[PDB]
Design a protein around this ligand. Sequence first.
Ligand SMILES: NCc1[nH]cc(CCC(=O)O)c1CC(=O)O
Ligand SMILES: NCc1[nH]cc(CCC(=O)O)c1CC(=O)O
Ligand SMILES: NCc1[nH]cc(CCC(=O)O)c1CC(=O)O
Ligand SMILES: NCc1[nH]cc(CCC(=O)O)c1CC(=O)O
Ligand SMILES: NCc1[nH]cc(CCC(=O)O)c1CC(=O)O
Ligand SMILES: [Zn+2]
Ligand SMILES: [Zn+2]
Ligand SMILES: [Zn+2]
Ligand SMILES: [Zn+2]
Ligand SMILES: [Zn+2]
Ligand SMILES: [Zn+2]
Ligand SMILES: [Zn+2]
Ligand SMILES: [Zn+2]
Ligand SMILES: [Zn+2]
Ligand SMILES: [Zn+2]
Ligand SMILES: [Zn+2]
Ligand SMILES: [Zn+2]
Ligand SMILES: [Zn+2]
Ligand SMILES: [Zn+2]
Ligand SMILES: [Zn+2]
Lengths: 323, 323, 323, 323, 323
Amino acid sequence: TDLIQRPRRLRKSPALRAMFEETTLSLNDLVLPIFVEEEIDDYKAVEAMPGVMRIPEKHLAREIERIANAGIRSVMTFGISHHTDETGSDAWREDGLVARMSRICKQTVPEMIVMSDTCFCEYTSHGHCGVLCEHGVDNDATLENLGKQAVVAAAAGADFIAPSAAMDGQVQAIRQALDAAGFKDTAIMSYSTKFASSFYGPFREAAGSALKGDRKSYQMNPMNRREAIRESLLDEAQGADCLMVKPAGAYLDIVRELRERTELPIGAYQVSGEYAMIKFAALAGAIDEEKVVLESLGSIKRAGADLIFSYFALDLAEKKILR
Amino acid sequence: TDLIQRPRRLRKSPALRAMFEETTLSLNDLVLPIFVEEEIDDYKAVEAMPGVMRIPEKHLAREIERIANAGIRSVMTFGISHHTDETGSDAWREDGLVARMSRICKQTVPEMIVMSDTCFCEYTSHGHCGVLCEHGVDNDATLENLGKQAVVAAAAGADFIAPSAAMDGQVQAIRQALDAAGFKDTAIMSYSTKFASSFYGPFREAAGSALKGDRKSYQMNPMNRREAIRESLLDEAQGADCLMVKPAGAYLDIVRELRERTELPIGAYQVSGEYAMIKFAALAGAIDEEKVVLESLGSIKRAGADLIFSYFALDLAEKKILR
Amino acid sequence: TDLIQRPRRLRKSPALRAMFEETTLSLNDLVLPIFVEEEIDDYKAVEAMPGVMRIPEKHLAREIERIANAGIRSVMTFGISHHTDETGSDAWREDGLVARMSRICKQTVPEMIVMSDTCFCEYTSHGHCGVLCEHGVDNDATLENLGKQAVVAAAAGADFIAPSAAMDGQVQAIRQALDAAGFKDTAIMSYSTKFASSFYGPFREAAGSALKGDRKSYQMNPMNRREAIRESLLDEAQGADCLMVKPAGAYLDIVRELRERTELPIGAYQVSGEYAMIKFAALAGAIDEEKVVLESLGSIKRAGADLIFSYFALDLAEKKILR
Amino acid sequence: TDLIQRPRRLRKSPALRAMFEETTLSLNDLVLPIFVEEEIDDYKAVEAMPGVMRIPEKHLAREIERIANAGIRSVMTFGISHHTDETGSDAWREDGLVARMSRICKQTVPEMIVMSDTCFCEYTSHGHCGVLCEHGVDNDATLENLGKQAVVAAAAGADFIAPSAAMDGQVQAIRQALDAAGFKDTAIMSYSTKFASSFYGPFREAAGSALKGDRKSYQMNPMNRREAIRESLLDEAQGADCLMVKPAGAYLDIVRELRERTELPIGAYQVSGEYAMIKFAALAGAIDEEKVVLESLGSIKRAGADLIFSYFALDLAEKKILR
Amino acid sequence: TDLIQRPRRLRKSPALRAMFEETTLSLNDLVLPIFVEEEIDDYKAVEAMPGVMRIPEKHLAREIERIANAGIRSVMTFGISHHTDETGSDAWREDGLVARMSRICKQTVPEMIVMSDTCFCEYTSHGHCGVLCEHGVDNDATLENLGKQAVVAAAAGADFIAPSAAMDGQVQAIRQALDAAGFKDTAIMSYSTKFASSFYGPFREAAGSALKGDRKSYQMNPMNRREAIRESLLDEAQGADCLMVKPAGAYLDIVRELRERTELPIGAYQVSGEYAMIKFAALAGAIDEEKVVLESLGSIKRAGADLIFSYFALDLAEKKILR
Ligand SMILES: NCc1[nH]cc(CCC(=O)O)c1CC(=O)O
Ligand SMILES: NCc1[nH]cc(CCC(=O)O)c1CC(=O)O
Ligand SMILES: NCc1[nH]cc(CCC(=O)O)c1CC(=O)O
Ligand SMILES: NCc1[nH]cc(CCC(=O)O)c1CC(=O)O
Ligand SMILES: NCc1[nH]cc(CCC(=O)O)c1CC(=O)O
Ligand SMILES: [Zn+2]
Ligand SMILES: [Zn+2]
Ligand SMILES: [Zn+2]
Ligand SMILES: [Zn+2]
Ligand SMILES: [Zn+2]
Ligand SMILES: [Zn+2]
Ligand SMILES: [Zn+2]
Ligand SMILES: [Zn+2]
Ligand SMILES: [Zn+2]
Ligand SMILES: [Zn+2]
Ligand SMILES: [Zn+2]
Ligand SMILES: [Zn+2]
Ligand SMILES: [Zn+2]
Ligand SMILES: [Zn+2]
Ligand SMILES: [Zn+2]
């Protein structure tokens, strides 16, 4: 055949493939989410997330050293609360669980980058990401509280405050609150573009949220690409340090579009349902787990993410699969 | 002060800097240029390129194993000839030096990616990159010969033919010649955008070109960004597999512009004068050599290059500075 | 060969090359940086910058006339201080060295465009670009001082205030301070995009900074192109008159990208390490100095810079190489 | 007033204006058009172009040396014929005027870049830019002749063939003709975008065209910007070396648009009527001639032209106004 | 010849040319500038602008009816003052000339769109566009006065206030002043991009400005395309209703660039020197006046202007050349 162009010329050997490979994945790309339960003694398996456990508070300092020693740079803290109430007020108590997770991690590994998931769905009786009203989840009452939580997390050592509540104006509320309290240098990792996704099931189990109902009056419609971009760019305008697309794996179009619309860094969250889908299919012999995980994570990087939140991170680090 | 945006938030610690670092440099990014002299016994120091030596042919198989064992993926071959003539005909002889460099490297390390610098300036009495005429360097007579050289290099094992002659239509001539001889899978690494630069001095010494005069009737004016882009895009149209900007270090604007005008891979050559400038200033105590080299190479990557030709490559690999 | 396109047609003669040359370099493109030491009598050679000297204050008026008579349009002032302290307060004293450099230059050559490097690394005991804290270099305490320095430099005659401290919000702080003091017409040449580069070594020696440590918590990571652009565009939003990329020579991708993202003028600083690399390699015979310098400077112009800060400037002017 | 942005800051002095001036004009930017009449003895004033003269053939060698000695790089040749006929056949005679103008210029100043206006309006009885038909100016019969003329001009020494006939497909016809005759290196300066302009009056007088009628069936409508761009891009596709917008002075929108649609070089012709408008208004005291000319030429450069054809060129060079 | 594309197909007849003509010129495109001298009896010829006269105030009401009856939609008023002073204060007097020109025009032809040139160069002893200082033309003192003038022009009937002073922040000053005085509906036709051009000579004579010196510390450098665009976009940000490029004829690149950077309307001023160049060359027989004028004006329209200020306007209207 007369073909001057032959893309196969660069695919002949593993060496040629490695030379020309456009996208690289390292431990510098990963953030490890961690589940911490107060007032328990034994690690608790999350059945819907095979291989993931709730870490007892009493063991946290141990676990964070281990995470640190594998070479992981950063964790995102999630609390399982034994102190829920109508407004999630334990989350703005100086020594409530949110504060203690951050304080423990930072005291034990001072160079660990600590990001504190900042919401109320894990602290509220009713299970919603904020203050419940006759009218539904009250945006502006929730904002005030997000500010108060951010202040105590920052006071306790958190490097990033990470508002996962999907409230309008939450970046700006948290920014004003950090600054007025003297935490000008504490960063905001906004969950800027966060969809009302069906991929979050296993996280219900891991983090114990009490919600009967849905988050569709605050979290945005999966199908809305224009609105997705807009949601993120609003957060840039309010001063966030890092944007984020969540979930990630079924949203790589969104990642890429955002990448071309901002210069800020972008995170992408490989959520619990994505984790569960890989684990369960691998348990069943249907895929090779390690190859799928690397491909899934690589894809998230290819699409434009600077940082990826992954539950696989510690395992990949302890096995030296990434460095 | 009232500043909501504080870029310094992400620069606080080495860990934060590493997380947010936009550009990564690995051994998969490097090609090692090598100087091979036929019919000598001892390694010959290049004074103008401290730390670089001409490798005797008789020692090549040894050197290529060593290069391979450091983890280097690819080399670019340059010959010092003891058989020069009016047309550089040793370079299209089946068993001339060009062919033997390629044959030795590939026989000794079959997975080594071998790229053969493809010209006549090292093989001609007069020292020009081709067939000398009354009218100057004859473009089309030179093209015919480039084809013949490409065929013998490919026959001998070269993965890439790399025309450094800066002749109009050289990609297409070499492509037609490889294909008509049955080397459809042999690739073309064009020196697509190659400037008539004053940064090539030390290479005169290393490769022993006999030229008294200049290359300005073929190599393009350093100052011509529009023409630079055009020169590369012509090569894409003729079917090259990889484009290249040379020199690189004072041409990162060019790299970046090209990056946004093509999807092909792009190489960038960190030439002998750049090497010499780093080495001599470091010898004099004026800079830290290792920090400068990493920054120089990183910059070339940042600007958009997929591959970088660097004389530092083996040292960085043997020292485990890159992997 | 059948080639309708032959780029070589326009490269045949020097005359054709000159007609089609896309980028021109003149003295209107150069700013000369100058080192002035207070309370000394003899010129002091900077060993790491061959051919550069510290000029005694007592000789400044002489040197500035000479610079002026060569046709140089503008200088950037750097002081070597015999009055350092914890905060660099000599730099906001009405008659401190910063003020006197500017006053002398302007009184002696009223039409000389004077730009005053505006920082504290040359005036502080500890050697940092500002107010040292438990927490590191305090951004906002540093800003206040930058304002006070800008006011005295402007009062003394400086045409441009040039903040090289890499503090967040420094353009706006200096702007508000100049305006509130009645210096509305004094311009800001921001060192907008200034990288934590290893190319600044020889400047340690020339300007005598006391720093043991690094500037990486304020100066930005070399590898971060997105952040580089953003850093500059923030400065445009705060009202700077001119932006700047520093270093320049390994950052021409950055220059070009910025060029397409703003209409403001852009400067580019050919820093001490670039100077040293050219000088040392030329001393060693490895390159032709004059050809390299012209090519380096031309490249900076090609990439999009309106102004270039170069230590070669006076020599090129006195020799009539540029006009 | 509270204005942070003050563009006037950079306009304070001539020195500041020169530093920030975006566009520069040199002799490397100019091509001098010249009128040569065969078979006359005295220089003949063109009344409609004050200060311009027809140069007798017998004096050409003298005039071209003078032009060369002023520092002019290039001329465009126009003949006044004493041998007109139905087809303009003197223009493809080996020793016809077109050939002799080129031969004389190149023999006398071998480094002079000679461009030969390539048409038939100056050689035809009827005065049209080609072969007259019942149907009007026959495009394809004209093309054949353009080829034959190009061959004799190239044989005689012309560096550029410059088809001013505005015939469809003229670049390609001339290219094929130069190549088949062995003039592969002879360049094409196409009058790519040439409008049916009322600014060409004084050229009727200078070049003595016999036309009673108009050129509107070949030269394009002044008002058609889309078609203007398209006309030029067709010429790029046929292989021209340089494009051109003519006239220039009332067509700077066209220049700029084209500049952003191609990487080729662009010329712009400051035509006879523009020349006459400046000269007559200056004669009348209404403008300062030198200031207007510099501004007019600068504007043409600003708009994006690499080369400008100007009747003022020799005067500006002899007076050292440009260098 | 084998050419499928033949642009000449659409140029065969005048009918085909008219069908495909991309750009149309009507009286709806023209604004007529008018010179009015107070306290004179006879019309006064402007020698440098053949065919233009100063209109005595006493005859204005007559002239404006005539202008109106030719179909002209709009005039721009320029006064010749018999009451100059250090600050141009007659221009903010309730019944000063600026006010009376506007009042007369609007009272006599209520539907005439009146635009009032808004400056001080015609009202000042020293002849500058504002308040003279030790430091030169004081920007902010001038702004205050521009506000006061705008208020009296608006009070007197002006539809547009048109600040030709080239002062920083003049749109915003005039906007705030109109609004605070209750003239919210009075429009601003900013002379947004106004160059320090040598094409304004004949206007010195027509409008009698006393300036010995230049306007280069306020009017922008002809050569600065980037700054030109920026100057206009600042004016859009301050709320102007219409932007303007002046001069126009040598600035069509600027018009077109601006056209693609804003949605506002754009005016373009065909200044006195352009007028004089056409008139003097036509007087001399060198061009056909009517054909040149139509082409010049058409070109300004082609380049993107919505409105064109032309001294030819009334003549073209009275002759029914445009409608
Ligand atoms: N604020 C809630 C929160 N923060 C993190 C996630 C899910 C993360 C995962 O599924 O791994 C959720 C749950 C939800 O929003 O419905
Ligand atoms: N075909 C010549 C060739 N191939 C490689 C280089 C220089 C590479 C270097 O300087 O490291 C040169 C020399 C030149 O082109 O003038
Ligand atoms: N404010 C510091 C300053 N201003 C100028 C430079 C270096 C200029 C050169 O290297 O020529 C430096 C040093 C540094 O930032 O580390
Ligand atoms: N082929 C004709 C030709 N070549 C140059 C010009 C005019 C150049 C000038 O007016 O200076 C003209 C005349 C026309 O096309 O009508
Ligand atoms: N404010 C001055 C003003 N307003 C109109 C013009 C010139 C208009 C013309 O030349 O037709 C000028 C003169 C100048 O700015 O120097
Ligand atoms: Zn409890
Ligand atoms: Zn929640
Ligand atoms: Zn939101
Ligand atoms: Zn031998
Ligand atoms: Zn060569
Ligand atoms: Zn090429
Ligand atoms: Zn002292
Ligand atoms: Zn400093
Ligand atoms: Zn900054
Ligand atoms: Zn004859
Ligand atoms: Zn013609
Ligand atoms: Zn055409
Ligand atoms: Zn009076
Ligand atoms: Zn004025
Ligand atoms: Zn303005």
